[PDB]
């Protein structure tokens, strides 16, 4: 642990184009394993990992028919929110939802959660008690009053505690080897000089999975977080990720600096230093 089963839902109104677009995307430990998209040729739930091809036809039909029902609900919710904010029907708006559960190595429920957002702003969220809600604005207080008097939080609690956990538990067993997943980074340091008294040292990390990683530059012990520059982790487009961090140093002082790569797949953190051929 901690293992997670999250479902990411998007609903976007598209006036003067067509019907609203709808997407559900399931994740297992932040790994896309299922997906539904209304703008596909024939909208159905499809596997996004090859370990999901185990599941039978009754599973896919059930999940597919469920998604179409969900689409219609969010179709109504989009028109409801126009009313709450008194907004025009000829403008595009986006409803997003993340709904999932997390379990530890033992299997116990650590955190269950469900939270909504309208036009990229928090709308309403289920508290960690799985009993009460938290409205983000006056519009969301209308929804808060409904679901509390409707006793909706309790019905969600059943799904999150029971169903979500039990199915998450099932997926982990079907994709244990695939989700055990680790590619160690290939790392190196490039030198980028300039007509100036300084040079740029750039530490690379390539071909690694999962995307969780930390690169640091150090000067004789201490880490140079402030003067460091780094890019956000990025997909290579083949299942692996890339990242680099860099530092500007005085000319002729390259051997004073040390790059460090921290990653799961490594037996121990890599320690890199600028070295020419020459």
């Amino acid at each position: 642990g901690p293992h997670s089963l999250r479902y990411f839902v998007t609903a976007v109104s598209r006036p003067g184009l067509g019907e609203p677009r709808y997407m559900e995307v399931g994740y297992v430990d932040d790994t896309e394993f299922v997906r539904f998209d209304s703008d596909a040729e024939n909208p159905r739930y499809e596997p996004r990992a090859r370990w999901m091809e185990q599941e039978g036809p009754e599973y896919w039909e059930r999940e597919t028919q469920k998604a179409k029902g969900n689409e219609q609900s969010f179709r109504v919710d989009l028109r409801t929110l126009l009313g709450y904010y008194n907004q025009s029907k000829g403008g595009s708006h986006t409803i997003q939802v993340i709904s999932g559960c997390e379990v530890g190595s033992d299997g116990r429920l650590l955190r269950g959660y469900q939270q909504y957002a309208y036009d990229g702003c928090d709308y309403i969220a289920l508290n960690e008690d799985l009993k009460t809600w938290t409205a983000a604005d006056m519009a969301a207080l209308i929804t808060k009053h409904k679901w509390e008097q409707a006793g909706e939080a309790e019905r969600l609690r059943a799904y999150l505690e029971g169903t979500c956990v039990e199915w998450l538990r099932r997926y982990l067993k079907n994709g244990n080897a695939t989700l055990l997943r680790t590619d160690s980074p290939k790392a190196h340091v490039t030198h980028h000089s300039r007509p100036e008294d300084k040079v740029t040292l750039r530490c690379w990390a390539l071909g690694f999975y999962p995307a969780d990683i930390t690169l640091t530059w150090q000067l004789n012990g201490e880490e140079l977080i402030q003067d460091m520059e780094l890019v956000e982790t990025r997909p290579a487009g083949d299942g692996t990720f890339q990242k680099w961090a860099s530092v500007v140093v005085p000319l002729g002082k390259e051997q004073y600096y040390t790059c460090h790569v921290y990653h799961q797949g490594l037996p121990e953190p890599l320690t890199l230093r600028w070295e020419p051929p020459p």
Binding site: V34, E63, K146
Partner: peptide
């Protein structure tokens, strides 16, 4: 197993 029967806002 995605959530079914989403409550209306």
């Amino acid at each position: 197993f995605a959530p079914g029967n989403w409550p209306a806002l």
